[PDB]
Structure 1
Amino acid sequence: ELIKVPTIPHNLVLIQSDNGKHALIKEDLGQWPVETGISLVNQAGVFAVQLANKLGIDKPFVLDAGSNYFTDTSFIDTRKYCTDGLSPREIQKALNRQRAYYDRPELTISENKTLLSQSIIYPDADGNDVSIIFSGAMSHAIFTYAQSQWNKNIIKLDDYIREITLTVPKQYRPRRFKEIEHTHGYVYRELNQGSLLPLVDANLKESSSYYFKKLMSSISNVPVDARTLQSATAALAADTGQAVNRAQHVSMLTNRLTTANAPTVRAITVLTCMFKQFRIGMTYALDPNIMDVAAATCMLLFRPAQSISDEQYRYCLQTMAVFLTNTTYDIVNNDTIDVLKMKLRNQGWPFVERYNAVEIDMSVEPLRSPGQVGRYYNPFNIDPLTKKHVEDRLEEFINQVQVGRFRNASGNAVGTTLAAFLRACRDKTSANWRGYSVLVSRYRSLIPNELFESLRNISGEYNINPQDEHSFFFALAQINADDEFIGAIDKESAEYLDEYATLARDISNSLTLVKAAFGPLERTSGSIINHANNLNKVINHVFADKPLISETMLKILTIDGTTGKDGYRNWLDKLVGHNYPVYVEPVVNIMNFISARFVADSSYFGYTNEIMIMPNHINVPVDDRFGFRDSPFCTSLPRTIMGNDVRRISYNVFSMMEDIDDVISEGFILYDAYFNFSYDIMTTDGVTRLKEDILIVTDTGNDIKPIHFYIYFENRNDKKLRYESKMNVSYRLYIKTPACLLPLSDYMRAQHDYVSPSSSRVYIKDPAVVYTRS
């Protein structure tokens, strides 16, 4: 959601002495401690975020400052006087006090509204409003840049509809938008798509297990019709001539028709048609019987070929050859597929081939996949064009099996039972395939193309017992889509999009952290130990307070029972050294700009590169613009004093010394450190002096005490103060003049402009273009 900022955040504060002889404007912008020995860019990152909070920049926003204005009472003056920034009245009072001290006349009537009308609101050509006010240099730069970065995502509503017009299905009622929203509508949206590949590639077993289980959970809850299989059993019984007082093979098939595990097999069937390669397998009994041959034939006929592996194919052929060709398992252990194919065919069994599954293209573009076409396998290897099984020769193959003599020379007991069984199985599939085809289409729409191409069956938890194969196809049920289930799918499609979205952000955050936190690993004990300790510190920080990663990924990473903290640490290991492309977001750009300005302009935030310590009896050039008494600031650090280059000493060497008494008498410049400092400008006239001593000398080293300046204004004819400064104070400290200060005479430089967009724009919170049917 966008935020309207009502007031421009100026930071200027004006300080003036009691006499009014001097005045200056300052940009506070806070004061921040900076350390040494640690890289400054890393320290600038945390301060940059805190600065954005101070300016109200961090969250997406648009400026609303058009309404803040007033009009002067004069007839001619139709200008829109602004009410933001440093008020021109405050500047007018400061100048009038300044003119009083010099005994000059006060500002003229004509000069008053020249000054008072500098802050204006004027319209722009594009309908926007431009606000000109007195603001700080740093505040203007950061706020203007933040507005530019956020405005990229703010796009017209009609543009958004064009980008999502491909993914909208044809079964949802179109949304009607008000005419105002069409002409003057804008939407804040991030149109980047984050790939889920880093999570899936590194963690294939965990990601596949999480998605298959949730998908299986929904499919198992689908309604189905309830039709008794007594009619099918009677047809099977009559064809086989089943008797109560005999032992036939039809009894063994009939005995174990269990439909208890039907919903799980139904879910497995949809999963095979959903994904490119969802391999399933079954383990047959030690001594195969009429069921295993019936179950094995059912898999080969009515399952996608891509879902059957080469090893599983040979295993099914071996089981059929054992029962029909009547040979031991050890005999056909080394037999190839072709050898097993030939032995079965000579016996009279032709169902020795796997059949590919015809692919049906999706009607609309899949989610999280731009410019791509979806596809899924049609269930039961049925050609949509011909509404038949792929093998057009199935009917004669069934007859061939029935006349074939397997497991016995006299009688067709084995052949008739299997052929009569496959008659019903083919009839059931040829009637109920349309419902399963729609069900696969609904669930395939949830998964993206990357998950379609990557997810693989690894855990092997989705295995089907031979009893379930022959009972599922014999007792196949029509899929009935109740309104409750239709509504339930609409609910599931909601969080699937939301959970995909939150995973993309979590990966992008994780990839960015890895690049900066860690580096390459060598083959030494030192490098290994450094990685072990550093990574533990990172993993402890991310999980402290609010975790950086949402609970959505934690569920994926903990699917094996591993603790979430350990799961993320192991994933961060594989992510080091990645070449995965990450797109710089608007927020990342904003912090980098502040980080650059923090390093470039160190005076705004309260630290300096170098300081100077010189004896009082040496006169150095100082900044006399502000009129401070013994001004502690310099325009630049003097290169040469008294014709000799000023000595430069680094901080570490300075702390290390014992002749510190010999070098202070000549003066020096301390560099190679970040000197935090502070000052308090006072309106009265007094001695400018440091708050504590300059340096502390111990038996270990020499350190510089904290720098706090008590700056006072200067009056030339104050003999008491002149003697005090020259005599009492013996040593002085000098730093570069802070850039935040600005003399009152140069107040025109504080003028800055801001752009607040048109007030005719309306913002659409929910840009969805379709309505649920019911």
Structure 2
Amino acid sequence: ELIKVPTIPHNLVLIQSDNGKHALIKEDLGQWPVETGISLVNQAGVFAVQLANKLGIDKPFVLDAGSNYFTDTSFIDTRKYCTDGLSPREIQKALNRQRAYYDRPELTISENKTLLSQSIIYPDADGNDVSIIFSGAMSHAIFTYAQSQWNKNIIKLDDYIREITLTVPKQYRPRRFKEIEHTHGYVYRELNQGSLLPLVDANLKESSSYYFKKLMSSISNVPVDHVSMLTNRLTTANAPTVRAITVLTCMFKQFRIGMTYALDPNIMDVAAATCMLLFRPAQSISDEQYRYCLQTMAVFLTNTTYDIVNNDTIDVLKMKLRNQGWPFVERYNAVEIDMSVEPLRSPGQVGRYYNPFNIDPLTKKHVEDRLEEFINQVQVGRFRNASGNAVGTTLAAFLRACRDKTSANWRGYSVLVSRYRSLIPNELFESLRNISGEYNINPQDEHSFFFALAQINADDEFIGAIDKESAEYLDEYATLARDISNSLTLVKAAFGPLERTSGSIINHANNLNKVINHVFADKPLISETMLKILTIDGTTGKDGYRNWLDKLVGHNYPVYVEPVVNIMNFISARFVADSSYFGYTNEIMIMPNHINVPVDDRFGFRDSPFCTSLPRTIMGNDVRRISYNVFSMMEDIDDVISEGFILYDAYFNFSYDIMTTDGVTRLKEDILIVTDTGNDIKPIHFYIYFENRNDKKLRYESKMNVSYRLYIKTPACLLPLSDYMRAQHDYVSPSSSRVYIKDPAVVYTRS
């Protein structure tokens, strides 16, 4: 849901002396500690999220500031006066006091009116309202950039409908939006689809097992409405399980199924083998299973042994069976039916599914046009004996019962396959495979399934249950895609390549544990859905994630850069680039008091510790530069510090408070501490006072009491009061006529 921000964060404070001579404006973005010796960008990212939270730009938002205005009492003035930002009255008072010190005339009525009308709200052509207010530079830059990133995912409702119009079926009642929604409706949606392939490819067995078991639990709940050996073995105990396998074979591509026969085949095993080859897709039967089925029929019908046909090829087995009089030696490809709509999570793609029982939808019969002729062949065949025709007649009668059952019930099963197929995306259709053979069919269950085929009843309860599953599947896929993106970003930033050295292996293992322990603390980064996928093999979810992350190192998978990543990258870059805004610097200078160094005189400070830039040369000679590590290790620091130097190669955190009175500008603590181990710089805190230029006591105190001074570059947050026009910044707020739709669904759930 979009957040509607009422006010603009300006972060401006006005500091003025008691005399009124000097005033300044400061941005207060806070103090952020920086540690030396480690990467600055890595610390910047952590501080970027906190800064975004402070400014209120972490979550998607729009600005509602067009109602924050008033109107002047003058009849000529019809302008709108914005109430956001630093108030122009405060600047007027600060300027008012400054003129009092200088014995100058007060601000005139015309000059007052110009100043008090600097903050205005006016509308543009598009209907948006732009507010011109006094605000800090860094806050304006970050806030405006965040607006640009979030507005990319705000589109008109009619634009959203066009994107998803190819995924809406024809069994759902269209939703009538109100007239206001159609003209002024807007929705915030992310339209980028993330691939589930990285997780599926890395763990094919676990991903396949998870989805296969989920689908079977749903399908198994669908409502439905020599001869002695065949007739004594019928059981409908596992018919719901066989039914789910049938739907799975047709809804997927290459879902291999397997049957295991007994050591000594009988008429039931031959019946099951024939039913498998006749009424199941060829895409779901492997070559080895095809050979096993041919061998089983050859063993029984020809009265041979498994040893004789163990070395026989497919063509040889077909020749042997055809000579005896058995024509059922072929497997048949199923006929693919195209889905009426584009499948979910498959943009610009066409989905397809096999028609059950190898029934051609055009002819509404079996794909084998010789089926009736073949059954007559079996009925007049002499198998396993010299005469009697007991086996042929029994198999002919059993085959005819299966043929009528499949012809009557093909429409019902085709509807079931089509509805469950719409649940899975195209990537899962083409990638998931049956590994470990964790679903198999007993030969008795197969021939009982086709002899006692049950019609499919689609009650209102079943339709409602499936619609609930569709919502659950959509959320599950969306959650998985997000966690894949999060994992891919984490691996790229935190891991590198491996080497055949002990140090590299030790380094990788320690880093992997540190990452894993961090991502599972507090609220886990990874969702419970994928933890279920990785735990399905019995391993701990924490261990499974560690294994998956290691596999992902060095991937070339493309990851879409989302708006939140763009926002933090902007804040991180400005954190490094403009360090003075955030209270740290990379260079300080220590000089004796008798050395005159040029400083920043804009603010009227007494002995200002701020220089516009640290001088390159002092007294005609370049200033010495020493790194912090060498400085810490020095033993002759007394001799070096007598001439003054510049310290760099470290991140110096500093603080200051500007006092309105007049006094001796100094530091809270001493500059350095000398120990037998090394020398360090104590925490830096400046007490800055404004100067009266004629106080002899304070002039003497500054020259004689303090002997050494510390100089840093002038912080960019400070800005003299005279340059208050530099804080004038613009902000655009979208029109108030827009309506944001929380539920952008286009159809209802009813037949």
Cα shift readout 1:447-472 (whole Å, capped 9, x = no counterpart): 00000010000031110110110000
Q: Matches of 1:681 and 1:736 in 2, distance apart?
A: 16
Query: For 2:162 and 2:387, how far apart are their aligned partners in 1?
Result: 72
Instruction: Tell me the CA shift for residue 719 of structure 1.
Output: 1.3
- Looking at structure 2, the residues matched to 444 and 631 of structure 1 have their Cα atoms a distance apart, in angstroms, of 75
Q: Is the 8 A contact 1:405 1:411 kept in 2?
A: yes
Residue of structure 2 in register with 1:711 after alignment: 688
State the 1:523 CA deviation.
Answer: 1.3
Structure 2 partner of 1:247 = none
How far is 1:575 from its partner?
A: 0.5
Structure 1 SS opposite 2:306: coil
CA drift at 1:169: 0.2
**8 Å contact kept, 1:155–1:188:** yes
Q: Is the 8 A contact 1:185 1:764 kept in 2?
A: yes
Residue 39 of structure 1: aligned partner: 39
Aligned residue number for residue 723 of structure 1: 700
How far does residue 720 in structure 1 lie from its aligned partner after superposition? Answer: 1.3
Deviation at 1:290, TM superposition (A): 1.0
| Deviation at residue 520 of structure 1 after TM alignment | 1.1
Distance 1:205 1:644 in 2: 73
Q: How far apart in 1 are the matches of 2:436 and 2:627?
A: 62
CA–CA separation in structure 1 for the residues paired with 2:630 and 2:296? 85
Q: Aligned equivalents of 1:409 and 1:503: distance in 2?
A: 64
SS at match of 1:555: helix
Alpha-carbon distance, 1:708 to partner: 0.6
**Displacement of 1:300 after TM fit?**
0.3
CA offset at residue 691 of structure 1?
A: 0.5
CA deviation after TM superposition for structure 1 residue 605, in Å: 0.4
Partner of 2:71: 71
Contact 1:26 1:740 in 2 (8 A): yes
Deviation at residue 105 of structure 1 after TM alignment: 1.4
SS of alignment partner, residue 674 of structure 1: strand
CA shift for structure 1 position 396:
1.1
SS of 2:580 mapped into structure 1: coil
Partner-residue secondary structure (3-state), 1:604: helix
Distance 2:594 2:665 in 1: 16
| Secondary structure, aligned partner of 1:684 | coil
Q: Deviations over 1:207-233 (max 9, x none)?
A: 0000000011100000000xxxxxxxx
Q: Find the counterpart in structure 2 of residue 294 from structure 1.
A: 271
- What secondary structure is seen at the aligned counterpart in 1 of 2:234? coil
SS at match of 1:710: strand
Shift of 1:599: 0.4
Measured in 2, the distance between the counterparts of 1:719 and 1:334 equals 115
* Aligned counterpart in structure 1 of residue 654 of structure 2, from 643, 666, 677: 677
Q: What does residue 546 of structure 1 align with? A: 523
Deviation >3 Å, runs of 4+: none
Distance, in Å, in 2 between the alignment partners of 1:76 and 1:737 is 44
How far off its partner does 1:202 sit?
0.5
Deviation at 1:111, TM superposition (A): 0.7
TM-score (norm 2): 0.99
Alignment deviations for residues 28-85 of structure 1 (CA, whole Å, 9 cap, x no partner): 0111000111111100000000000000001000000000000000000100000000
Q: CA deviation at 1:687?
A: 0.7
Matched residue pairs, number? 750
Q: Report the secondary structure of 2:650's partner residue.
A: coil
The equivalent position to 1:666 in structure 2, one of 633, 643, 646, is 643
- Offset from partner CA, 1:229-261 (integer Å, 9 cap, x none): xxxxxxxxxxxxxxxxxxxxx111111100000
> Which whole-Å CA distance do the structure 2 matches of 1:695 and 1:345 have between them?
101
Could you tell me how far apart the structure 2 residues matched to 1:679 and 1:251 are? 100
1:119 and 1:132 in contact (8 A); partners too: yes
Give the Cα–Cα distance (whole angstroms) in 2 for the partners of residues 215 and 453 of structure 1.
16
**CA drift at 1:662:** 0.5
What's the CA shift for 1:410? 1.4
1:120 offset after TM fit, Å? 0.2
Structure 1: runs of 5+ lacking an equivalent: 226-249
Query: SS at the partner of 1:577?
Result: coil
* The one of 571, 580, 583 aligned to 1:606: 583
List gaps (5 residues or longer) in structure 2.
none
The separation in 1 between residues aligned to 2:140 and 2:177, in whole angstroms, is: 38
Give percent identity, aligned residues only: 100
**C-alpha distance in structure 2 between counterparts of 1:736 and 1:27, whole Å:** 16
Whole-angstrom distance in 1 between the partners of 2:197 and 2:622: 60
For residues 672 and 451 of structure 1, the distance between their equivalents in structure 2, rounded to whole angstroms, comes to: 53
Tell me if the contact between 1:209 and 1:459 (Cα under 8 Å) persists in the aligned partners: no
Q: Distance in 2 between matches of 1:334 and 1:654?
A: 84
Alpha-carbon contact 1:635-1:736 (below 8 Å) kept: yes
In 2: Cα distance, 1:755 partner to 1:772 partner: 40
CA offset digits 1:310-347 (Å, max 9, x no partner): 00000111111111111111111110011111111111
Q: CA offset at residue 758 of structure 1?
A: 0.5
2:494, 2:266 → 1: CA distance? 61
Cα distance in 2 for residues equivalent to 1:127 and 1:361: 47
Find the partner of 2:352 among 353, 365, 375. 375
**Using the alignment, how far apart are the partners of 1:323 and 1:718 within structure 2?**
121
Q: Offset of 1:399 from its aligned partner?
A: 1.0
Distance 2:233 2:450 in 1: 13
Question: Structure 1, residues 343-388: CA drift from partner, whole Å, max 9, x if none?
Answer: 1111111111000000000100000001100000000000000000
Q: Using the alignment, how far apart are the partners of 1:497 and 1:607 within structure 2? A: 47
Q: Alignment partner of 2:658: what SS? A: strand
Aligned residue number for residue 118 of structure 1: 118
CA distance in 1, matches of 2:476, 2:99: 67
Measure how far apart 1:709 and its partner are. Answer: 0.6
| CA–CA separation in structure 1 for the residues paired with 2:206 and 2:682 | 56
The answer to whether the 8 Å contact 1:186/1:764 transfers is yes
Once the two structures are TM-superposed, the CA of residue 740 in structure 1 deviates from its matched residue by 0.1
Matches of 1:326 and 1:344, distance apart in 2: 11
Matched, 1:530 2:507: yes
Greater Cα shift, 713-722 or 173-182: 713-722
Counterpart-to-counterpart distance in 2, 1:703 and 1:286:
86
Distance in 2 between residues matched to 1:529 and 1:334, nearest whole Å? 52
Q: Displacement of 1:103 after TM fit?
A: 1.0
Query: 1:645-666 deviations in whole A, cap 9, x for unaligned?
Result: 0000011111111010110000
Any idea what the Cα deviations from partners look like across 1:173-229, whole Å, max 9, x if unmatched? Answer: 00001111011111101000101100001110000000000011100000000xxxx
Q: What's the secondary structure of 2:403's corresponding residue?
A: helix
Structure 1: distance between partners of 2:445 and 2:148: 62
SS in 1 for 2:536: coil
Query: Which secondary structure state, in structure 1, belongs to the residue aligned with residue 46 of structure 2?
Result: helix
Listed one character per residue, the Cα deviations across residues 534-573 of structure 1 (whole Å, up to 9, x for unaligned) are 0100011000001111101000010101100000000001
TM-score (norm 1): 0.97
- Deviation, structure 1 residue 716: 1.0
Does structure 2 retain, via aligned residues, the 8 Å contact 1:19–1:101?
yes
Taking only aligned residues, the RMSD between alpha carbons, in angstroms, comes to 0.6
Structure 2 counterpart SS, 1:4: strand
Deviation of 1:722 (Å): 1.1
Q: Give the Cα separation in 1 of the matches to 2:670 and 2:456.
A: 87
Residue in 2 that maps onto 1:127? 127
Asked whether the 8 Å contact 1:435–1:478 carries over to 2, the reply is yes
- 1:513-538 deviations in Å (ceiling 9; x for gaps): 11100011111111111110001000
Query: Which residue is 1:15 aligned to?
Result: 15
Q: 1:721 deviation in Å?
A: 1.1
Offset from partner CA, 1:88-130 (integer Å, 9 cap, x none): 0000010111111111111111111110000000110111100
Aligned to 1:404, the other structure's residue is in SS state coil
Report the CA distance between 1:612 and its aligned residue.
0.1
Once the two structures are superposed, residues 246-294 of structure 1 have per-residue CA deviations (whole angstroms, 9 ceiling, x without a partner) of: xxxx111111100000000000000000111000001101111111101
Q: Alpha-carbon deviation of 1:715?
A: 1.1
* Per-residue Cα deviation, 1:671-703 (whole angstroms, up to 9, x for no partner): 011001100111111111011111111111111
Task: Give the deviation of 1:593 after TM superposition.
Answer: 0.3
